[PDB]
Amino acid sequence: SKVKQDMPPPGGYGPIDYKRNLPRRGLSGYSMFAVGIGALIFGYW
């Protein structure tokens, strides 16, 4: 019978990811200072 050698499947393997993926998130900074200062002024009152 014919050979069997554990070759890769026909059509190649799928696309592997290797690049960096660190997704941006969070608020705009303006909003964070605003929330802090609002809580601060409310607590002062």
Partner 1 sequence: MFFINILTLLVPILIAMAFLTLVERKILGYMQLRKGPNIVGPYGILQPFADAMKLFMKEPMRPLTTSMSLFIIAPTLSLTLALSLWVPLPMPHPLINLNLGILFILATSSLSVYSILWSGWASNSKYSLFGALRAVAQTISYEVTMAIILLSVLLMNGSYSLQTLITTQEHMWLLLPAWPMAMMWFISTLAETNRAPFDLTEGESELVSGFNVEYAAGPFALFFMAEYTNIILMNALTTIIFLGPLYYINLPELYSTNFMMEALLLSSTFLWIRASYPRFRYDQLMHLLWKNFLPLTLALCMWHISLPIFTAGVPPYM
Partner 2 sequence: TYKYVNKKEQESEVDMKSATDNAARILMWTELIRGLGMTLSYLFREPATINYPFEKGPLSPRFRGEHALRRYPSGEERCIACKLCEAICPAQAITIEAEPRADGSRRTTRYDIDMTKCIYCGFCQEACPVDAIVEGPNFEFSTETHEELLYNKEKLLNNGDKWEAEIAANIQADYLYR
Ligand X SMILES: CCCCCCCCCCCCCCCCCC(=O)OC[C@H](COP(=O)([O-])OCC[N+](C)(C)C)OC(=O)CCCCCCCCCCCCCCCCC
In the region spanning residues 5 to 44, those forming contacts with partner 2, defined by CB under 8 A, are 26, 28-30, 32-33
- Comparing CB distances to partner 1, the nearer of 2 and 25 is 25
Residue nearest to ligand X (CB): 26
DSSP state of 10: T
Reduced to 3 states (helix: H, G, I; strand: E, B; else coil), residue 16 is coil
Distance from the Cα of residue 40 to its chain's centroid = 32
Give alpha helix (H) positions in 1-45. 30-44
- Comparing CB distances to partner 2, the nearer of 20 and 41 is 20
Provide the binding-site residues for partner 2, judged by CB under 8 A.
Answer: 26, 28-30, 32-33
